[PDB]
Structures are given as structure tokens and as C-alpha cells.
């Protein structure tokens, strides 16, 4: 832009309001023009960027006088509004995702990642026949897992109308049709949620997350779901402390059947003192645990 030195980048002097090059100090161009608002409005709200770019339509307000009403007791000018059937689907899905996420009290950043995942899939258009609620509820599952805090399928299925089988199929098909790799869950990621819901203290939480990580690392129970070893970790940490919790209350939070938690407990039991940390205040002795 500078005549003598065109290669140098222009530095901006907003205080002095002009374009100056930093070699010879010549002022190029004209006075800088602010692109922001002059007040501290004559502009409207921006289009939602994730919503597809439609039209800059306005709305018609309520009638104010006799000239705004027809003689059969109604307004002459009606608030007809254009919107694409694709934008109607995106809006109704986004309005379902915020409903879905706020039922389990997700933060807004998971919602924004879900809406990013929904818009990316919907424009790529590989999921033609599956219901919009099913694909949206699967995108909420992935965005929860991609932020390092995944959820149980039963936890998401409790909120949505969509069954576990259907969201499972939608979860498989989205990963295949997005070429997106997502990390495998562990037992430590399902520890803070499953322990605070049952009203257990921090030291009980630390004991539960230690015996769960030790069981996975030692590889004592192949092929069991991480839910079944997390609830077993809660069951030992609660039965070997003051705050006792029965299998019904633990399994209700975990969705794990009161069969499955015993099936998990019949093999993790006989090596109990190896799993516990060396600095745990044992309110209940290890040999005093019930033989379940």
C-alpha cells in the first residue's frame, strides 16, 4: 500500500485515526472508519450463525388504532413470516436440544458443541430417514463425550423420547458418516457424577475412584461395562464407610439392574484390601463386608 515500501504491513493507530506504515512513516489511504456502532440502536439482531442463512424478514406489531383493524374485529395487516422447511427442522431440533440439555443441567458449551455437531451432520445429509429427535439426542451424547465428561446411554434415554436401541444405532451411524474419532471412556470419568448424586463425602469418592482405577489397571474383570465396575466401586466405598447405600439406590442412579451389580460384585470381592488406598480411614473393616 505504501509507495516506497509496498511489502511492509500497515500498523493501525486508532488513537490518531489513520493508517501508518512502520518504515518511512508515510500516512497511506484516508482516515480510519470504525466498523462498530456509533451509539452507546438502528441495527437488528444478527442471524444465528449455526442456523442456515435465510431471509432478513421483519415482523408486524400489534394494532394501535382504528385504521389497523378491519370491520370484522380483526387486524388488516397480519404477521405472516417466511422460513425454510430446513430452517424449521433446525430450529425445532435446537429448541429440543436446549430442552434436552437443561433437563440434566448441562452447560451451554455442550449445547453449542451439540448444535455444531447437528448442523455439520444435517448439511452433510447422510442421515435421511432417522427421526430428528433421535439424531439430535445422539449428537448430545457425542458432544458430552467429546468434552471429557461422557454420559450413560440410559441417562440420555431418560430425558429424550428416543429409546436406547434407536440412539445406539444413531450413534453408530453418525461416527461412520462423519469420520470423527472419539476416545474410549473409562471408569474414572463416571465417578464425580455417580457419587455426588448418592450424597457421599469426598474421601468416599476418592476411595471409590481408586478401587475402580485399580480394578481396570489390574484387569480383574474383562468385558464388563464401565458402569458395572463404577457402581461396584460405589458399593464398596459406601459399605466400608459411615454413609451406607443399598444396591437399590445405587442401581437406580446407575440404571444397572439389582442382578448386574451382584454379578459384578461376586468377582471384585475377594481381592478387596489390595484395591483400597493405603491412607483410607476404614470405618468398617474389610473382613466385615457382607458376603455378596
Amino acid at each position: 500500500t505504501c509507495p516506497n515500501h509496498p511489502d511492509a504491513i500497515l500498523v493501525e493507530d486508532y488513537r490518531a485515526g489513520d493508517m501508518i506504515c512502520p518504515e518511512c512513516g508515510l500516512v497511506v489511504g484516508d482516515r480510519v472508519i470504525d466498523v462498530g456502532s456509533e451509539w452507546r440502536s438502528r441495527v437488528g439482531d444478527s442471524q444465528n450463525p449455526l442456523l442456515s442463512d435465510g431471509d432478513l424478514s421483519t415482523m408486524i406489531g400489534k394494532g394501535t388504532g382504528a385504521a389497523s383493524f378491519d370491520e370484522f374485529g380483526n387486524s388488516k395487516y397480519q404477521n405472516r413470516r417466511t422460513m425454510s422447511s430446513s430452517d424449521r427442522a433446525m430450529m425445532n431440533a435446537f429448541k429440543e436440544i436446549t430442552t434436552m440439555a437443561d433437563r440434566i443441567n448441562l452447560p451451554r458449551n455442550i449445547v453449542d458443541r451439540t448444535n455444531n455437531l447437528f448442523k455439520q451432520v444435517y448439511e452433510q445429509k447422510s442421515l435421511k430417514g432417522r427421526a430428528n429427535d433421535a439424531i439430535a439426542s445422539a449428537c448430545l451424547y457425542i458432544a458430552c463425550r467429546q468434552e471429557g465428561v461422557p454420559r450413560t446411554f440410559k441417562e440420555i434415554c431418560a430425558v429424550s423420547r428416543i429409546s436406547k436401541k434407536e440412539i445406539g444405532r444413531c450413534f453408530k451411524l453418525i461416527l461412520k458418516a462423519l469420520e470423527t474419532s472419539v476416545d474410549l471412556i473409562t471408569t474414572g470419568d463416571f465417578m464425580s457424577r455417580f457419587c455426588s448424586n448418592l450424597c457421599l463425602p469426598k474421601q468416599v469418592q476418592m476411595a471409590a475412584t481408586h478401587i475402580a482405577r485399580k480394578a481396570v489397571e489390574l484387569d480383574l474383570v474383562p468385558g464388563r461395562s464401565p458402569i458395572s465396575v463404577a457402581a461396584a466401586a460405589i458399593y464398596m466405598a459406601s459399605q466400608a464407610s459411615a454413609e451406607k447405600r443399598t444396591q437399590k439406590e445405587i442401581g437406580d442412579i446407575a440404571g444397572v439392574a439389582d442382578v448386574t451389580i451382584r454379578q459384578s460384585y461376586r468377582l471384585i470381592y475377594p481381592r478387596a484390601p489390595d484395591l483400597f488406598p493405603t491412607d483410607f480411614k476404614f470405618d468398617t473393616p474389610v473382613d466385615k463386608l457382607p458376603q455378596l
Partner: protein, 48 residues
Amino acid sequence: YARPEWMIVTVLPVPPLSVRPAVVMQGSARNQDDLTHKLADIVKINNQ
């Protein structure tokens, strides 16, 4: 300079961009002016 039929407008003059500029307000988001929104409704009804 002013005929009576010229007051009954049949073509609507669209203002230039210097009359209705688009602002940038806390990030990359072009907030259009009220005239641009109103001229959007003019074209949509006229096309309809």
C-alpha cells in the same frame, strides 16, 4: 419538476450502502441496518 403522477411511486429507489451500512459488533457478525431489513421485506412481497 413535480408531476402529480410522480407522487404515486411505481419504482422504489433503493438507498446505497453508504446510507445503510452494516456494522461489526463484538466479533464477526454483520448486523444489517433497519433499511436493509425493510428492503428485504419490500423485495419479498414484490416477488410474491
